[PDB]
Amino acid sequence: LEEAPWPPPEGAFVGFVLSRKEPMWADLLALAAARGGRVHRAPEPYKALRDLKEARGLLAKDLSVLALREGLGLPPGDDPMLLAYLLDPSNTTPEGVARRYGGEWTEEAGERAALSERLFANLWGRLEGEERLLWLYREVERPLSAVLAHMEATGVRLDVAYLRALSLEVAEEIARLEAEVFRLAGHPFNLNSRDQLERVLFDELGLPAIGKTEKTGKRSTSAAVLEALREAHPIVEKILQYRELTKLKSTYIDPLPDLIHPRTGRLHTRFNQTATATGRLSSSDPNLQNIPVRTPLGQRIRRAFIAEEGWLLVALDYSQIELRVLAHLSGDENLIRVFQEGRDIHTETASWMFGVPREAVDPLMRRAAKTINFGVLYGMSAHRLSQELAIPYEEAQAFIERYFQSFPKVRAWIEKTLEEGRRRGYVETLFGRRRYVPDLEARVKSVREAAERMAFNMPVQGTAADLMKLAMVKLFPRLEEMGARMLLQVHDELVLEAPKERAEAVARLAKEVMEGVYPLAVPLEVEVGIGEDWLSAKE
DNA sequence: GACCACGGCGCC
DNA sequence: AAAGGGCGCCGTGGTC
Ligand SMILES: Nc1ccn([C@H]2CC[C@@H](COP(=O)(O)OP(=O)(O)OP(=O)(O)O)O2)c(=O)n1
Ligand SMILES: [Mg+2]
Ligand SMILES: [Mn+2]
């Protein structure tokens, strides 16, 4: 290009280089911004941030978070990554976008800046006429990048000392199981090694191999596999317990405390805006969208996430979100009436499994019905359902036949979605967010049908993601007026942090904002709870 | 040290 | 395991 003197002109496309991928832990190595025929490089990166008024370019949110870390108000402007992601959800990284639309993602701030300008021109040029994508960009994604920036920079408080002592506790319980797995095995080995375990269970012990692995075709030792052999030998019962514990200790209990930022005393996740194929968000380093909740030990980990002194956590989750979305998208008179009568499909389905009244269904029994109702909905097999519920295959198939018979309009939408998908080559959400499926007309029955399940799942899951995103955009400005913070987003759940005084008012406000974000043919009811910790905030 | 494929699994 | 979908992270085992 051409060397220009810092600062750059108003609205120059910025390019930056970090020491590591986490903006909260990264050192701003280099900083530059591209203008028409100029490069505008910076001498000192941290001082150069003071000159900028807006971050426009590739990964705009990342630099914004780093600036927001240094107490700087540097909002996220245009981001070509957002443009490419809307053009195609496949475009997830700058490395994949640049080579597709003329350019090369490098490690130079100036060349990264230059790319951001030219990539903008191509992508914004290809976004002409796509008013459904433009509306989804200007009114949702582009504002959301600002909200996510404040969320990542804020972070969530974690009870360090609690998890520390909890680690030593789980440790002794792991050694007990491990010692109780060795004796039955007759010898010691690596329980973490599925290879060594496979030999012990199937070659040494007389246990039957029930499943194979995908890539290598080895005898599987998965949970579902061991679940079937839970009475074939007592060692299997203990392995499942060992699996659960080491899983929680190696993923959450141990890593999370060492992820606390020294200057904030909080946990800072990354909300990837262009990572999923359905339009969902993504949480990484650390993943705060997969904090355990199912098991008792998992709930103990959940309580480690607490509010700041004098503050309270406020959790809001859309009740039966995709089922309501499905009711709006399909227009099933029976399904719409279900919610209009204030029914709970998860509760009734759990009432059928355990053979108990709807009132006898506890919060843990109902949750187990989610994977079944959602499973069956998106093409689960009667075989798989039979084994999970420990019921005969004849009883499992009867559920599916009865499940889709309660609502004789959903399948009309499913085939409609697939047919429209085979014609256009892509399925779209309620707002217009499209996903290109290239195997709807595949010749292989496996490849074709697998692409089909991805095809009609995208509009329902994607719509829910769209509604949540739009809700966050409408809700966030209201938070700053009441001194409230937006902490986490869990697909259909929002975790807020408000002062103890107005914590009640925030919950009532946030609930109403989320319920009326986009009125459908079905009411979008939201369950809200206030607690001193995350687990308490959902009870 | 940085990276990779794989099985496995936590959540939504 | 399998005809549920969407993620990220873990240890193992391995390469460079
Ligand atoms: N095993 C699962 C669980 C969830 N989901 C999707 C469906 C909706 C979305 C979030 O829904 P949840 O909050 O997990 O459950 P729900 O349907 O919203 O019901 P509730 O809010 O009462 O738990 O994630 C899924 O596809 N598969
Ligand atoms: Mg939820
Ligand atoms: Mn929900």
Short mmCIF file of N, CA, C and O (backbone and C1' of nucleotides) and ligand atoms in Angstrom, two decimals, chain A residues 316-318 321 370 490-493 538, chain B residues 11-12, ligand 2:
data_model
loop_
_atom_site.label_atom_id
_atom_site.label_comp_id
_atom_site.label_asym_id
_atom_site.label_seq_id
_atom_site.Cartn_x
_atom_site.Cartn_y
_atom_site.Cartn_z
N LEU A 316 -32.43 -16.05 33.53
CA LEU A 316 -33.67 -16.11 32.77
C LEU A 316 -33.55 -17.09 31.61
O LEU A 316 -32.65 -16.97 30.78
N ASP A 317 -34.46 -18.05 31.55
CA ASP A 317 -34.45 -19.05 30.49
C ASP A 317 -35.82 -19.15 29.82
O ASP A 317 -36.84 -19.22 30.49
N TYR A 318 -35.82 -19.16 28.49
CA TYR A 318 -37.04 -19.37 27.72
C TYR A 318 -37.56 -20.78 27.95
O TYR A 318 -36.85 -21.76 27.68
N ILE A 321 -38.32 -23.36 24.59
CA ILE A 321 -38.10 -22.36 23.54
C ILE A 321 -38.30 -22.88 22.11
O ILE A 321 -39.06 -22.29 21.34
N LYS A 370 -36.02 -33.89 28.15
CA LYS A 370 -35.63 -32.95 27.12
C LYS A 370 -34.95 -33.65 25.95
O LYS A 370 -35.34 -33.47 24.80
N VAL A 490 -26.52 -18.42 27.56
CA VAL A 490 -26.49 -19.86 27.32
C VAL A 490 -27.58 -20.26 26.33
O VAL A 490 -28.55 -20.93 26.69
N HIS A 491 -27.40 -19.83 25.08
CA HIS A 491 -28.31 -20.16 23.98
C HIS A 491 -29.74 -19.65 24.17
O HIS A 491 -30.21 -18.81 23.40
N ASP A 492 -30.43 -20.16 25.18
CA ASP A 492 -31.77 -19.67 25.48
C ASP A 492 -31.84 -19.10 26.90
O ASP A 492 -32.92 -18.83 27.42
N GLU A 493 -30.67 -18.90 27.50
CA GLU A 493 -30.59 -18.42 28.87
C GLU A 493 -29.69 -17.19 28.99
O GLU A 493 -28.64 -17.11 28.35
N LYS A 538 -31.58 -20.40 39.51
CA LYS A 538 -32.45 -21.18 38.64
C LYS A 538 -33.35 -22.11 39.44
O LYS A 538 -33.83 -23.12 38.92
P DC B 11 -24.21 -31.63 32.19
"O5'" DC B 11 -24.54 -30.39 31.24
"C5'" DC B 11 -24.22 -29.07 31.66
"C4'" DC B 11 -24.33 -28.11 30.50
"C3'" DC B 11 -25.71 -28.01 29.89
"O3'" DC B 11 -26.51 -27.08 30.61
"C1'" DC B 11 -24.05 -28.17 28.18
"C1'" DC B 12 -27.85 -26.10 25.31
"C3'" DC B 12 -29.41 -24.94 26.75
"C4'" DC B 12 -27.99 -24.84 27.27
"C5'" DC B 12 -27.94 -25.10 28.76
"O5'" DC B 12 -28.43 -26.42 29.02
P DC B 12 -28.10 -27.14 30.42
MG MG D 2 -31.52 -23.12 28.86
#
